[PDB]
């Protein structure tokens, strides 16, 4: 299972990507929360909004405070990222800002499948 240095080293790389420096939902700076489901970075407020969606629509974990990351979850973050998600969503007909509408979209459904596949494929 990944250790602290492995987790921290990886998120330093990922959060250094400029497109990962703005919350996926609201654009707020320096998002430190993740929805593993979509491989996206969220600000603390939006992390709370995602909690109301429920774990089957969005699985939330801190990239800073929480060290319960497994390799699959880390790889979802790596194969994902905010740029990839933003492109996929618009390209599959979803530019809704409202979280309930956005995460029940056909695009969100297709994307969580894509993330699982790519994340799985990313494992050694
Ligand atoms: Zn936000």
UniProtKB/Swiss-Prot annotation:
It is found in: Cytoplasm; Golgi apparatus membrane. Residues 8-124 form the Arf-GAP domain. A zinc finger (C4-type) spans 23-46. GTPase-activating protein (GAP) for ADP ribosylation factor 1 (ARF1). Implicated in coatomer-mediated protein transport between the Golgi complex and the endoplasmic reticulum. Hydrolysis of ARF1-bound GTP may lead to dissociation of coatomer from Golgi-derived membranes to allow fusion with target membranes. Vero cells overexpressing truncated ARFGAP2 show accumulation of cholera toxin A subunit in the Golgi complex rather than the endoplasmic reticulum. Interacts with the coatomer complex. Interacts with the C-terminal appendage domain of COPG1. This is ADP-ribosylation factor GTPase-activating protein 2. It comes from Homo sapiens. The chain holds residues 4 to 127 of 521 of the full protein.
């Amino acid at each position: 299972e990944p250790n602290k240095t492995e987790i921290q080293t990886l998120f330093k790389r990922l959060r250094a990507v400029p497109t990962n420096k703005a919350c996926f939902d609201c654009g707020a700076k320096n998002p430190s929360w993740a929805s593993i489901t979509y491989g996206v970075f969220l600000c603390i407020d939006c992390s709370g909004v995602h909690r109301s969606l429920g774990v089957h629509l969005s699985f939330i974990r801190s990239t800073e405070l929480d060290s319960n990351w497994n390799w699959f979850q880390l790889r979802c973050m790596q194969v994902g990222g905010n740029a990839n998600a933003t492109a996929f969503f618009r390209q599959h007909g979803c530019t809704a800002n409202d979280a309930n509408t956005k995460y029940n979209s056909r695009a969100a459904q297709m994307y969580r499948e894509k993330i699982r596949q790519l994340g799985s494929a990313a494992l050694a």
